[model samples]
Target chain A: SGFRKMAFPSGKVEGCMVQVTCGTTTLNGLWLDDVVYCPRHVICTSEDMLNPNYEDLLIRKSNHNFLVQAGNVQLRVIGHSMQNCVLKLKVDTANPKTPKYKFVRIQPGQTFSVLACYNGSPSGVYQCAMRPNFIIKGSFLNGSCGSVGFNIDYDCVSFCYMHHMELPTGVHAGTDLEGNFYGPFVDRQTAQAAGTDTTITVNVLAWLYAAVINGDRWFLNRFTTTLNDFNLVAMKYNYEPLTQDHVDILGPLSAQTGIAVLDMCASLKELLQNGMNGRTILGSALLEDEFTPFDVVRQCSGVTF
Target chain B: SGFRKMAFPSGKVEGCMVQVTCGTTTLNGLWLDDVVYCPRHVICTSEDMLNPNYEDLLIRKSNHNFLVQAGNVQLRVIGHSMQNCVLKLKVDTANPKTPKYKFVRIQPGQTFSVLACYNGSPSGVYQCAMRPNFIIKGSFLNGSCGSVGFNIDYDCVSFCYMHHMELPTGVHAGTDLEGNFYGPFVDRQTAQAAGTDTTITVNVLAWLYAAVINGDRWFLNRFTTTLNDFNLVAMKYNYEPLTQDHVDILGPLSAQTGIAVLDMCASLKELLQNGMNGRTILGSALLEDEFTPFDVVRQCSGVTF
Candidate 1:
């Protein structure tokens, strides 16, 4: 029990010898003919070599086995159906309480990937699940796809895998592939958040204010597209119009995006007229100045400073 | 005390005579010539006679006053927008404890009407309001067009009125024209009714079963149209199908409505495949066979005997 032989199956240096004491003794420069060969063994199996429980070994090989090539944690969605597919991925970390999730929208025909990092290091075991358009599809450690536990022992390596998942065209009230339904809860929460008329009105105002201040053509175009359904009657104007300036900023974007600048103007005009909550409230409420779309735009632009 | 003269402005003896009485005694039939032509006067103005306070009089005339033309009560939407308009009319009765509403989808170009009759006759004063697509519009006594309080005095006469209301296109989250928001309340109450998945599923099953058994083609078409959203996978059948009989009953309706006999079949197939709330069991509890949809239809059909 004091020492063991250093064996090389190649037999070129079968006599690689080293001495070892029970406790604290060092083999100074003990070598296999000039090379320092420590008292350890290495085996090279032949192609025909097979263990008796080959199937069991194969199962264990795939279980909790991750080959983290780089010192980083990565989860990927392979063969995702659509580019516009939005996924909400939850990563259950070693610290159960501090769970993590990433909202990812992948590009078309490409794999969707999300990285996980903890405090200072990517050294943590994590169970992951993905929900596509509010339907939970993939899962780990709970009889779902990738139900195997993943180990991130830092000593070796780690990686996780997911499979192809089918997604629906639109939102539905049913459960996902993994028997989980969260859309109703999410909808209920959104409605709860927009519970009051005042809150909803304020939120709409703030959202439009920011968009207008930034001269965000994308936001303006998208917003106007939604507002095209309603009619607006602007009450009055209390501010000077920076009309030409807005046109100059949005002119190129309008041509490129095939969205008219007049559309945005119409939206602003209507919003100021309607005032929100499905009524013509701009004229209904008494304000310090006339509540006009022109004033909103000017004020929003002036706030840029 | 003495009898007063019934004066007639049109001369030539007008020839209308009646009995005269002070307290109890009456001269059976007295001629106007013999009786005293009382000092009470009558006058006829020529050349477009008009009242000075005509505006105020008009307002009062259109206010909460109702003249029931016939014995039967009638409410009408005269000046309505497009025929595709749907109205949810809530009539608050004299009995404040009980409120009644009707979800009426009126035809295009037709006057939308809903008759209200309670406890043998329309004998209670009812305040009515009509909301178009959930947006309250055109109310009267209490507020808007028909915003008048309709007095349903059976002893006298009573009929309600609804003004021509301009209805919005879609559902809005604001209160009705009279500052009443019933949609949210209705939604909340519906959600409360369908609080549990079990409750919703049972309700859906009961709905479909009733439709299928009665061979109510209209109900079947409507019910299946709603079930078109989610994917369903019905497990093993612990129940039987009245396939041939249902086919025979729905055969004629299938041809006329352009909805296939197989549409109902498909509905049943999918509903069975996907049990409510992602399971095959309506409830994993004990219940009679009569509780099953198939049994319900069979019993309903047999009830004609």
Candidate 2:
């Protein structure tokens, strides 16, 4: 019978696509994942994955010698992000005290064919680990010229009219301890609409993160300044040194991200109002300022730095 | 065969007990509740109560309907609220318009019972409504005794304490527009615990409702002198004016009347705090002070001559 390769050992019995063998009337079967067969007169031994302690697939070749051999077989291995790992193939005796097998290192982006031999019977379990073939780069943000410089915050509430913009008629302040800046502008909207003393409140906050951890950071280096499709992705990527501008920057990233942030803020306000303290509201990955020390965040990835 | 008289037609059928006939074979097979039957025909007609249109009991039978009438051939009405009703016995078809049966009123405290008759049935579906049977009386409050009352222009904050006798700390003497007294002396509980401060506050609220309704007569009547049973019930009883001891003078002939003066004060505060046209917090309630004036509750059934 003709033999074919497969992504997994048990897949479709390793079909040869309508091809068949016309040799001697010896046993003929397709080779697929974990398949090992031996005749009644052949001695075979194999390791079982499910019940690791047993030597399954063993065949009594001659009944008296207690010898074992592999008949026909197949094996497959998959790859994942487990750092460096090499796939090795081997063959060994059935004795646990002095077992032996052959090996070949198959790096990632590479594949190795299983070895085969005929004796009384054939059986064995293979071993492998994820191994890197070469260094590959991850996607990132691109600032102007794909550089990691020129980081700045942009205020959103300044001119954009959401519902109605009310200016502060009472206080002219520098900033709150939390860095929320308000109270510097006149009530222009109010003055224009009502024709009376329409003094409203004014406040603005803005901020963004810098990848100071890496010199040529993949994400920071690729971060775009102008608003575009890349903004959609940027909204998901977190930045340090939160401010009103930081809140503003997320909207440009993606409409969905903007909607998500709006929903998140509303939900947060509701939770605070109703006292619902779920972990999602307090996760550091989402809003680090809730847990991280203000100084540490400011020093490492902030505007003042 | 022995005969037993029953209160049917007007009576309700209820309970789990069953009846077995032990006499004359010619009388009839057992008849069911609300059903009519003649001994010769051995026929029965069933009756129902849940149907709102069911017939009312209008039968009169003096003492001659049963095969062997027993002691007091009585027909006591079961579910009716009618009191002191009477009954008699007779044939069914003679006054078909009003079945030939005795009539009786059902008293409030009576219980339903099982009875027997030659030409009727037994069943279970009874209901009754409970109604009171005695007279209830009314009284009034007079006024607070002797102590000069003061009007409070501020709101008092509430607090719980082991030293419940402490007078609320911030009360100050003030007067309402009518030159009548109000409060600075905390609540009633605090006033009760106090030896002197208590005399001040109770006199204030007591005299307040009193002056509003002219309670110089029975100020200490049950209407006003009753102590409040904690916060479960509001302090809204009519005070009967009393001119005797402090406790005696709280209220007796006093009318159940008082004006909620703070809402007016709040509106006034809003006018002064933000000026005449700023943010109107009191809304339409304030609009009526000058535009509308009406009779402040009058016409007492027994005391308001």
Candidate 3:
């Protein structure tokens, strides 16, 4: 508030007793559009020295707190642990029920208010997530680092529908620091969104396709890297599609693994189809283009899905 | 059935055609020790084999298909995938309503059978579960060769559970590998077991403790090595536990982190309590001398059962 120095008929006295604030003005006259406002100023009142009430609240959203109030969200962050640490944040709406988590990765300390922004909401019900990153600094296995999370509010989402988030990280025994252990880590995230199941389902299908076409590699890689133990080679039967009734019986046994019976009667059907170079109508049905004649052939060969 | 040479007792030529079927027979001769009354094959007829049919009956409550079935029982594999490529199995009854998976990892492509010795009673399943030692090989980061998953079941169990099955594995950036990445990995079984609230809770506590404590590194080693991108250094913040409210508030601000607040808390507690003397306290509730303290701490930290 400002007081007016009115110019009345007899107001020309040498120095009228008028009070003026020391530094309540904006710079460069942003408030007054004058260059004189750019100069330094001294505080006049305690109110002037302190930030005004609701100053920050003015720019704040009334429902900001509700943004993070949403339930668990996750992200599948994959990258080189030693290189760029990729972060993602994926959201899962509570109403839509999908066990699989859909996620988006977020960078370190993303710009979201940590303070509650919603009124009349339960405490700690906000949707924001936390991710703390660190690297091993000291001795044996030094410079190794990784991350973790907070709550259901921060549940993860799986991008590419990947079971693991590939990260850049590793361990070295012989022991040179940087040169020894280099890598990409596997990260897991889950997410859910509305009505976009097409895109989401498409991505998931691609991942499933990878899992199927590369079952051997998939299991093997998971076995070698994820399991860390190097045994069970005896169980490592090269995957071929189900052919015999004995192997195909596994489908009726468990739905987690879908099994389909192949008919030798369809041999001519395959003969007339593009059997090689992955030119089969079957690939699309399986939600992937990488499926090849060999893949389908393997499906018909035996071993469970 | 082997033909027996017959010699008359009193120089009398007495040789009768022995029609041996599924019945008991006794041998009374000087070679009786070597030729027992009736061998298993002799006493057990094909009819006997067909009588106690126990095909596809779930024995050993595991979710996997029955590896072997005979008589009135089947071997159900329900063992977990240890961190490494190790597979352990469990045995259980076959009732679907009361399905129970016992711990047992069976060999692949092996034959098995079950037997019902009595009437009105369920039978048991059995298997040889044996395989010769063989090399497990795979392509390495060298794009050339790598030998992995090589240990026997016994060795795998020991390595995975006792010696910390965690290992370092990766393909060097092959000219083909997009990121030319490499690092550590834990197999599905181990990961699952670990990921379960039980394992995860314990792991988080151990890691949190190790981050602050100088000498205790078991959990740190297990966690860092098993996780693809574990950061050993950043984990040090645990001993410096932030206030619960601060942590809760701080959590949602970051995104895409592999480590969680609970995990961080556990690690911090472990490390701080343990100090640099290669000793650790279980949790806040116990002293250093108690063994159950660690487990109890783990439970409190977040693990289920």
Candidate 4:
């Protein structure tokens, strides 16, 4: 089959996935993420040997939906620094579409990264943009709480389930942008406005649709965390923000007005972990952070506002 | 609570459980097992480090069913060699009811064990027979396949399920006498005489009866084997021996003429491990060896043969 590789970066995806139009075929590319582990402990050896206690750095999470496309050159260079991550794009007044914004590591001293784009040939304003297909490992000190924040279109999300107590070690205060729950935490501050308190049982059988016919066929890929008791339901789709609709549908009844249960295996001991709020990891939820919600819902409720 | 610790050892138990009667109180003490890890890889240091290749040593598996009595004394002393283990005691010309005989470790040099009886007073033929309260660590080398055999009265068992590849590492070719399958393999020789080829699913849920209200509420005490995939179904009971009725009711349809499936989680790749074997570990079945069968059947089927 002479099928060509299209770009999410080209189709310019917004939600969990996107559909691209090719010659006589339309391609579907699932959204993916690239992670970067910046140096921990000492000041990073970069452009200025800079190591500020705290600084908000801004960056962009690149998409690979358009890989293999001819003449499209896109590269993401990462070093370090501040700014909360965001998932919306703005028109350059020249190019109508742009890549998603994600402010990964803050805590100053970290170097920097930018999506470098150059094309062998161009249309009008530009045509080539490249993103790193792998995670970047920066050599520096560990970050803490104020290092990460939320800003994916300010849609607000309330289904922040507390799957874990703390973030992965090393990063004193931050989230793994590569994780499912990472950006699912995107519009935190705005989340309080939307969410429900109704207790809905997902009748596991009905919810899974065709994912499993046996009802008990749950597959586990990561046991990195010790929350084995179905503490936090596994979520899918990297980086794309979780919408309010998902909270209403998947979030379990909770005591806190704007929070919900995260683990697929809900129990009496599942404490509320994070809040869909402006602050990062300290008050953030692992449930919503490392998420993988139903695609039927994700595709159905594409691109959060 | 004026409750007492009744015995699987005393409640005159068989199979997985036993219901006992006390002073205005009836108690349930799950069938328990006492294990003896004989010295491995050496000519055991005993009465006479007298080592032999193969010898079926016979002994008794004691019961604690009626431990805290007014003045009942029961003690079991163990040593090495001769005879296979068997349940269902015979009525002595004098006593009427006797303890079950089980031939644990065979081969010489493996000291000896006997249900030694001694009491302050007596009636008719005798009064007190004390059984070992704990598993005796016999001093000796490992045993081989010909060491253990089956003879639980003979009614014939067709449901010899193979849950394991070989017996746990040591013992050369023998089975763990304390495991669920040990006695379940009792009537090996007789099994071929009585068995059917009909497949009956235990509708997991309905079969558990009330053991679990939640269909998935399975509890595991041993992860001894690397069977994380519900490989061999966890069975109950320590030694009472699996009967023909159980094979018909619980055993899954299998390949061999008289053999049936063993693991609770049956799959396409579950190769048949052991048969309802009269032979020792060489061709023994761990499924039946480390067994834990259903009580509804056990109590209903009662003592085998």
Candidate 5:
């Protein structure tokens, strides 16, 4: 994966490259910072591409495979004739568990998603069998087009988390195509420094108080979108937080939706308290702010740790 | 309006009618429980029919109309065409609001859902325009067929609650065709006795602790399935509970999924305590068992509410 991928690239290419046939096909001197020029006007630079055009459902004729990183990743097949055009999927088919799938035929107008959950150590692969003629059209992987198709839009934080070998992703900016953000937020570099930089939990919580509760849309948006994925991984694999119930407490804060300022102190407090498995009453709790949610439950209900 | 529906019903008929087209066609003479025999192995006697067959979704060719009750009632269109086969819809089109759908085309493979909300009191109506040749087949609303057809599967506790003239539906047995139970279950006769109906709360909670917490599979299953809908209506309308936060507390307890015994006290307690706009710890609150969740939050965090 050396840098200069200056040749006329193929349908799909990994890493960065350079190209000439663009907006001003002939107005170029030296081809610069080039990635696959996916005509969907969306240049997929990430490791995975699900409907790069965000259009058709038909995908590659061969097994459309994806890496199961973290969270409740699901293979969502959207189509009308769920009965007639049932999509064939195989999740963790390699190390088969969870009965592979008993019955996942999608309901008429609902998305038929199979929770492509992988409880395996490290990453794994899950795939879907593309229909012949791919939605009954003359389209290939690069040109997939039709009424419906298979798509991979699950929480694959592990993939994006480990997207770079030398930099921190979520710790910085790791937004996917549909504008979703994921976290650990402290990337490999920091977490690797201490096997588990548990102290970063404060950084996360601090960001929560000042920005999230303080009406910061940036953090609020992430809390709504990516936080769900973060909680999914945290509980499923007990990542960044290093515990399951910690996951449960925080994981559910993902669903603690409301006017943030109105819900923070109490919602966040209970999450921290509940993280200890329905127990909390230590003045020396994680991060103590006067308006700290965990402590406020104590202030209002009578015990502020 | 009349009971003698024995004059042979039409393609679609109103009121409960008796049918002779039975397994034993002429075996029983009285024609007792005469309901419209929908060939989809389902019968349509619910005043309005979405897809009596549970299969095909090609609902009424004219304008598919439905009653909007409580919760987040959404008009979900299941199809596979954001382009060629865009299903034209008109929610409360009779009297448009929310900009009448700026843009709501079904994503390639995702169910296109519209939050068919009716802010007006006394409930309202919503409809979806049907596609011509309905999914390219010979299926009518009654004979809906094919891989993709529109079906009505949303939270409609209002219709089901008022399904009978004498019975506490959610209070008793009000399971829908697909086996989903709705709430406000107290019968009309009981609730009509009062204007706002402020006391059916305990009866509902009594059923929770003794059964839900006591590991009764019956209540647990309903919590996992119908509880979501219950929370929808409770929070959206502040019914049964009579308060928004009460609903928030119970609404989210709906999300409190666990092994029941392991998480009931903890989960239910957290939910009730978080009810007063995310502020809890009041002992003289709602229901109480020796193993009460609301009280334990008080015991652990210290403030005996």
Candidate 6:
């Protein structure tokens, strides 16, 4: 009930045929030029293109526009008065760049998924917004247009992004990178973009990375070596020892760029190197010391590994 | 109701005159030459000497009588017919000729105590019976004695003795004499006189005596020495050790005929001679021993001692 009906133009605009539909609200009788126009008697109006009925809009634009500093790329059908509307999408960078966008069409009743992973999508501030082409018009009557108007008369939806790749900076070797130090990189992004509260999972690997980076190998190897060799003995009373395959599931160390997946790989590499036997390249005699496992156990001490 | 009357003599017969009375029967009238006679009308008759009414008889002789060879000197008043009847007792050795006797008497209503220890009681067999000089009779008015009598008129008792000094002859320097080896020297008499069963208290000294006379001084001394020296450590675990007073309570070594206790004293005197530093005799060097004492206990090896 909040939307308004509008007029449309006949046939093609420039060399492209114009047709549009948002969900099931359609204007089969109208066609418009690149000069934005509204479809005749269509339920959606110019205001509808900016803010449509919540139910009729398949995907709604968020409160922030397409870009403000930086954010994920999002596309949605607000309103289309023409039939079989084919819309092109583009991102206009604020660096005074000429922008070219290609066909991104949606049939009635379909929605485009949000593109939160937009390109390199690194951490930083950026300026961007969605640019839609193709207009709307009133009905062709007596061989001429009756009334006409365009949707999204001005560039809409923009954002200022805070991608999770944006991390605290320092090049201190052996310590976890800012991305690894601050974890659940994915949740960090959702919290910033969605502007909601969140928490991270326990990242033990990150802890080990910090240990190694800090050059606390004695501290690191002490626990790690005991965990591997005399583990049953040390843990004979204290706790369970780690399994042989415990650190095996870590990812390859290359290509980690602090993105959610890559962030995990880097930290896991640190864990395997320090705590797991055979997996460690770093040398220490303590790591190789032979222990008799645990044929006998002392009450005050744990089983020998 | 079952007892008969008996007769007795007034003047010296066999150089002694005797008279007696028992329940309700008496005699004063008759005396015959060397034949059995009733003393007077008395409660117990001469037949009572042979077999009294079991209940009426003041003291019923055990089937076996006191003996000369081995046994306690026993005296009993079967029937006390008169007040304050002073009596005499004697243990005439068979190798003797003088028949001197002493008075040993009991008043009415009294039973005689059995003397289990009497004479130098020999081993093997011997013979004897109760020998009372006086005899019981019916009433003085009745010249006819209802029951005939002679003192000790039945073959109801006998004796056999193997005094404790009796020993299985052997020149073995450290062995017990036969009687000493086979003990409860007390029981030999009780079994001889009463012919009933008995048990003895643990006579530890007696046991030691046997040990010495049996020339087990080596064996006994070894145990006794270990107990004295290593005892503190050995008993530190398994059991309580003997008190210092344990051996102190033992009889004098000089009077100890067997060599064990004496031999133990001499060797302990020697052990003090060798192992002890000073001839102080008054000592303490933890008794100077090479005993592990209790790496084990009786449950584990009798404390190694």
CA lDDT of A114 in candidate 6?
14
lDDT of 1 by residue, B173-213 (tens): 22222223333322111121111112112223433444433
Please say which candidate is ahead in TM-score: 3 or 4: 4
Q: Against the unseen true structure, what C-alpha lDDT does each candidate score? A: 0.23, 0.19, 0.20, 0.21, 0.21, 0.21
What is the C-alpha local distance difference test score of candidate 2? 0.19
Candidate 5 — which residues are off by over 4 angstroms? Answer: A1-175, A178-305, B1-174, B178-305
Worst 10 residues of 3 chain A by lDDT: A29-38
Per-residue lDDT of A25-90 in model 4, one digit per residue for the tens?
Answer: 222221223322121211212321233232211212223322222223232323233223212221
Sequence-dependent TM-score of model 6: 0.14
Give the higher-lDDT candidate: 2 or 6.
Answer: 6
Across A163-252, the per-residue lDDT of candidate 5 in tens digits comes to: 111121111111122112222222122332112222223223433543332223322222321344444544442323323333344432
Tens digits of lDDT, candidate 4, B1-305:
00000001110111212222212322221112321112121121232224323222111212332221212322222222222321221111222222243433222111111111111110001001011111111111111111112222222211111111122211112223332232232312222111221112232211322122112123211222223333233222111223344445444222211223333233211312322222211111222111123322322222212
TM-score of chain B of each: 0.20, 0.14, 0.19, 0.22, 0.18, 0.20
Better of 5 and 6 by TM-score: 5
lDDT tens digits, residues B230-292, model 3? 233324432212334434432431122344554554444444445434233221211121112
Each prediction's TM-score versus the true structure:
0.15, 0.11, 0.15, 0.18, 0.19, 0.14
Give the TM-score comparing model 5 with the true structure, all chains together: 0.19
Model 5 Cα lDDT, one tens digit per residue, B1-305: 00000100010011111111212111000000211111221112333232233223323222223221112233322221111111222233121211111112221111111111011111101111111111110101111110111112211111111011123211112212222222333212334221232223322343354334323323232232134544454454333432333334443234443343323323443344343232222111233222223322211222200
Report the C-alpha lDDT of model 6 over A93-120, residue by residue, as the tens digit: 2212111222222211111111111121
- Which ranges in model 6 have alpha carbons more than 4 Å from their true place? A1-305, B1-204, B207-211, B224-250, B253-305
* Maximum-TM-score candidate: 5
User: Candidate 1 DockQ category?
Assistant: incorrect
Q: Show where candidate 4 strays beyond 4 Å.
A: A1-305, B1-10, B14-81, B84-166, B169-305
Candidate 2 residue runs with Cα over 4 Å from true position: A1-227, A232-278, A281-305, B1-305
Q: Which 10 consecutive residues of model 5 chain B have the lowest summed lDDT?
A: B1-10
Strongest candidate by lDDT: 1
Of candidates 2 and 1, the better by TM-score: 1
